[PDB]
Design a protein around this ligand. Structure first.
Ligand SMILES: Nc1nc2c(ncn2[C@@H]2O[C@H](COP(=O)(O)OP(=O)(O)O)[C@@H](O)[C@H]2O)c(=O)[nH]1
Ligand SMILES: Nc1nc2c(ncn2[C@@H]2O[C@H](COP(=O)(O)OP(=O)(O)O)[C@@H](O)[C@H]2O)c(=O)[nH]1
Lengths: 302, 287
């Protein structure tokens, strides 16, 4: 029976430890260490460490504060890792705490006699250059003080979770944003059979707060029923559109879309919202849709 | 005719305006603002604002929304000039960084004070971008909500649909092989020889279901983007074949055989673990 300890440092490490405690990882003692006394307080770990409670005074670490707060806490760290055969040092590189504290904790863990494995992420490219270069410095220092260093790139992780190359990892998000704008602006500014007046958009959207958006696409004989219901319970909705006081409905279709289809989609959304909702709606033509229609609802008033 | 303007702020807002232009959104003037002049220089929009030109100097803001906020206050007059005359302004941004999070509420306020109907449309970050960025996004959402007429929020987490913690998987991949008994186990001294004084390691993951689950999972594992196309440059590797109660010795060895078949001698040690139904192969490569 080997003694295995995981010490999670900073935000990413604290996250990892909580997730291991919840998944019920067996036969491992967990430790959390963070300069931010707040994050520590609410942790699910039996073994808690506030780093450098002297200098930082527990008031976070920002983005040298990490290294110094680990040094100042060496005794609490040595005492929590004491007697381990293997120590995992878990951190996210790039931040204020994890970057500077991990190499110190690894050094202590290894000098005590533990087989010391660092496991770390490096930042997404969109986190910026300074953050990615701080991450590289911290990696090279951590490497000096571990037996082996498992390095997970958050860029490559995004490819795994999203299933697409990094270049395309936010295309779907970019596209929803495009749809959200276009849903409204086509009805105002692109002439079609049914446009909406700007004053009536204003009535739905002025001084409202949170506007819910659901998009749904459907095809075949029952496309209106499929499209409208998919928009009404879209995973993209913050909350239910039920009860909204005003809503905009954009019905988009190809050249074969019928008046009856558009009318059914509007009727479905009106019944789904219910009550005396004030509904306005318009249509848009998209000739690259083949026997499909898209229904978008923007609901306000809660 | 209504005058309609979209201003995209920060990296996400800038790529969103690019998508809107590519898709041929009509009737709308497009504007991009960023503290990072590099992203702006490759914008398809013909109206470009570098926020905080005098202080951040187009070099970017970093992680802190206060810098994005201060940059937008500095550029206030140039923002008003770009937006002047609009009846409706969309403010597009991704919450979580230093520029969108902090600049978007200021730009919203300027647009609304000019008289435009002002609509925010924003994304919130993935949960696995960590707590600093998700806390920032919460705060920036609330500040933007104060200054827009209407706020549409698109969650990246939920867009994922339409067991996530990579550090837990790396640790568990090794520990269950020695701390949890299963079909095949390893001794601490086996791990110690593969991992003592061995330097950089990388991790692979692969999933597979149904008939020939092994051939599928095992094959995905070794091509994993986490491995960065370098598994065969590893001298040693540990393999964790994890499955449901229906896991047999034949599956584990068919799995490990696939990997070994693309391995030299790559010294390979391996074991199993069990979960809720259906085959996951995790590779940790060292040396
Ligand atoms: N739609 C979209 N969202 C992105 C993109 N890149 C990153 N994001 C998301 O948007 C958030 C802000 O990133 P970004 O706009 O680049 O930050 P900033 O420029 O420093 O303010 C990130 O936390 C990601 O969730 C992108 O290209 N498109
Ligand atoms: N994959 C993953 N990466 C994270 C997570 N949290 C943070 N990170 C990454 O780790 C870096 C450091 O963040 P964090 O640990 O919260 O900063 P610190 O506590 O101030 O050191 C971030 O810039 C992210 O790139 C997480 O839950 N999952």
């Amino acid at each position: 029976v080997a003694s295995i300890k995981v010490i999670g440092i900073g935000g990413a490490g604290n996250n990892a430890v909580n997730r291991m405690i919840e998944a019920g990882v067996q036969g491992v003692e967990f430790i959390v260490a963070n300069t931010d006394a707040q994050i520590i307080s609410v942790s699910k770990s039996k073994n808690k460490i506030v780093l450098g409670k002297e200098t930082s005074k527990g008031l976070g670490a920002g983005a040298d504060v990490g290294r110094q707060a680990a040094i100042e806490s060496a005794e609490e760290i040595k005492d929590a890792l004491k007697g381990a055969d293997m120590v995992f040092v878990a951190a996210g590189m790039g931040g204020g705490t994890g970057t500077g504290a991990a190499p110190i904790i690894a050094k202590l863990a290894r000098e005590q006699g533990a087989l010391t494995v660092g496991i770390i992420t490096t930042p997404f490219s969109f986190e910026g250059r300074a953050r990615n270069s701080y991450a590289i410095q911290g990696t090279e220092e951590l490497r000096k003080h571990v037996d082996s260093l498992i390095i997970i790139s958050n860029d490559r992780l995004l490819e795994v979770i999203g299933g697409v190359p990094l270049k395309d990892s936010f295309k779907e998000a970019d596209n929803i944003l495009r749809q959200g704008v276009q849903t409204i602006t086509d009805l105002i500014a692109v002439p079609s059979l049914i446009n909406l007046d700007f004053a009536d958009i204003k009535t739905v959207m002025k001084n409202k707060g949170n506007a819910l958006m659901g998009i749904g696409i459907g095809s075949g004989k029952d496309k209106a029923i499929e499209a409208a219901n998919k928009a009404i319970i879209s995973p993209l909705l913050e909350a239910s559109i039920r009860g909204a006081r005003d809503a905009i409905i954009n019905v988009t279709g190809g050249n074969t879309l019928t008046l009856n289809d558009a009318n059914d989609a509007v009727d479905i959304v009106k019944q789904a919202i219910g009550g005396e909702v004030n509904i306005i709606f318009g249509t848009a033509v998209n000739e690259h849709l083949d026997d499909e229609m898209i229904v978008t609802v923007i609901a306000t008033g809660f």
